[PDB]
Amino acid sequence: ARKALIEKAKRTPKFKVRAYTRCVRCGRARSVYRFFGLCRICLRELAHKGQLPGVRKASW
Amino acid sequence: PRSLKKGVFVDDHLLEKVLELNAKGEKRLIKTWSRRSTIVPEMVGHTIAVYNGKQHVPVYITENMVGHKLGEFAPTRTYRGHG
Amino acid sequence: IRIKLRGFDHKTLDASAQKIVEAARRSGAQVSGPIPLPTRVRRFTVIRGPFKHKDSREHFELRTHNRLVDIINPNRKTIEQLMTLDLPTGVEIEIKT
């Protein structure tokens, strides 16, 4: 139950509380960041490839 | 609980059942899934079969169980004991 | 008239601010220098591995640098000349008054 779940989440529900976020890259439903729309795994992958503008490794 | 500025909630599909009964031969056996529906004083006297997730449990309503919800009278877990 | 310019990369933003300051003196209007505003830093922390290794993490940060430029006098000749400038695509501007 992966493709159907992704499409159903992409669909409008009868109630507004039944809408939940999913990762726009791999379809994950857990740990999805609002700022990027991506899950933590995809976020790390894309950040290591320089494809996230202004995003850099943090160290202080 | 629910706020008194809002009314007490009934699903309006079971309320229609009891209301239509009250003027058309008011005693039968209704099966419902609305465990969240609140019992109403009009519902007193009816036997309602409430889903527990597996089966419909018949509940006969009385006066001292008016403000509760239907789901509180259909237990959902069977325990017995350990051993 | 106040121009606020923001960007992810500070080098190109600084170059744009210096370009604005230098060009604004072609028809001098008592130019007010490009001042820096507090950088806004957004942090994200992720589990390093795809599964179960909570104690290992990686930190990422995204920073927004902000600079401000003011011209005391309008300088319409220098104002209409500011329409078509050399703006790096990473620099987002906003003019106001």
Add this chain to the structure above:
Amino acid sequence: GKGDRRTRRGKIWRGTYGKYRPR
């Protein structure tokens, strides 16, 4: 202590307000 909702310390611990911790 911090586990008592009817004190300033307990409301501070829960991060709420009321009669005992007014705003």
Add this chain to the structure above:
Amino acid sequence: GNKIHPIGFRLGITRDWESRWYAGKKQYRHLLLEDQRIRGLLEKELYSAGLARVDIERAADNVAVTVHVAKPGVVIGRGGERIRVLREELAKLTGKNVALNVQEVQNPNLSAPLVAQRVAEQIERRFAVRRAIKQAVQRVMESGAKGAKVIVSGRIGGAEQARTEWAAQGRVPLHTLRANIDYGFALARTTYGVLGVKAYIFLGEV
């Protein structure tokens, strides 16, 4: 888990971002999704052209897109017969104005993605793996690079037990930040599974 991504480690020091634009909290994710869509579409379009790098650049409702390929003619075609076409669909895939640029790579031997892609293509052709790694590393070293490394992981030669074979020459200082190291990755989908190919090319220190 052992090694950090060579490019991610040096972002803002030696390497530069592949996408360069500014967006606020309201527009960042939609532009990012559009960028991923564009890159994914172009990846399966110019594969035979030798697609190394795709750069997305946005000013205001207009996006640049500059691609770097081994053979620009494979992207442009006869009088641009393909160059225009790949642009038009892109607009129909973005709803904006696009300025697709084509750039030639001076040395295909010095671009780690191209080396990795070539090695993966050879592996898919049921070629020998160890010979391929040796030959690719020697080819890179023959073009003035100060060092090179190629690593292949998987069921090398269809074997039932996965192995890792790597070759190296010169210098590959992965712990040096001033070192300009280009990293490339490729996948080989053989009938017996997927093999991973990694390429490191060292081009001196800035």
Add this chain to the structure above:
RNA sequence: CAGGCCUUGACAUGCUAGGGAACCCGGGUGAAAGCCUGGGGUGCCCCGCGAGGGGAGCCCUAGCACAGGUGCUGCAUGGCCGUCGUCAGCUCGUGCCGUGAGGUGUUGGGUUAAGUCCCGCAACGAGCGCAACCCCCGCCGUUAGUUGCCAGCGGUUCGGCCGGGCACUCUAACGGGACUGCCCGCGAAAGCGGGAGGAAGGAGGGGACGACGUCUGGUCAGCAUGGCCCUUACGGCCUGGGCGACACACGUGCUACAAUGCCCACUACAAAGCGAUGCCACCCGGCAACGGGGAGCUAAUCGCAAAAAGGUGGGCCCAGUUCGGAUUGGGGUCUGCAACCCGACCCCAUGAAGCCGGAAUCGCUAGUAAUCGCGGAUCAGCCAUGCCGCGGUGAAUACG
């Protein structure tokens, strides 16, 4: 999981045929999905004032190629991660020794956090690691002075509010500064001890960074992928339930067992963050949660925001207590279509165990431990006492 439902399917290309759809508001039954349903409209290219017929964005019915599977295998795999271990190592070219596996180099002496460096040597050199190159903190300088700040000046409704200034603090870019650099001693040398100066002294403090390899290590449920398996069901939709069970056992935490304390009132002092179906000033009503008006702020401008420990004053007087706040009864607020199973918060009442914990076991060497509060991600709401960060107060000890 139970029940009710669908069949080329909730998603993708293609071959047909019958309609030609395309897009939009209503009818019965049902818990909903669904089933049976009642009223209008396709551009574009056509013969064209013609009945109309043709190719076309696109849709449905009946067939197919097929889609779909969080179904199995991490003992077929990629990618990523944990671990030995930020440990001081692991190797290579040529030469030389050995029948050979192999050795030497890389062993010995001194030194270092370090295969760090020096000396000696059948070795002479090199690579991956160490270190350095990058970030934050600590001192200073240049560029600047708004929404930042207010030393001097003049006003003032007493707030930098104003004029004004960039002195100072600060903000953020660029630089300098620390390198055994100097003096004394020790030693072939590397280096070790002492001192001056300096904000900083011997790696200045903290991050980022993890060698060849090991563990048949973890992940087919994040993704990808070989093989195997299902195909009006192991696919798909809905409602309800379960993941929240409970004779017990264990791990990680929170709150305490009190007077170096608890309660009440007044009164100080931060940092880093977040905010447009948002943050919400202020005023009104309720003891309150909160509700009703309603500014300012797309935010160095407005808000969250009260910091708490602290300081001052008073009360409690050694008690299961004005310690402790579990459990339960009742009245409410808010979010959500809906708080029964199974949310959070306010008020009233209830006021359990607990008097410092057996064998045993854990963390920590300095702005550390301990202790106090604050923010953020996810998020309608929240079961967060978790996690990632931030600052306030601030020890003891290391003989060996």
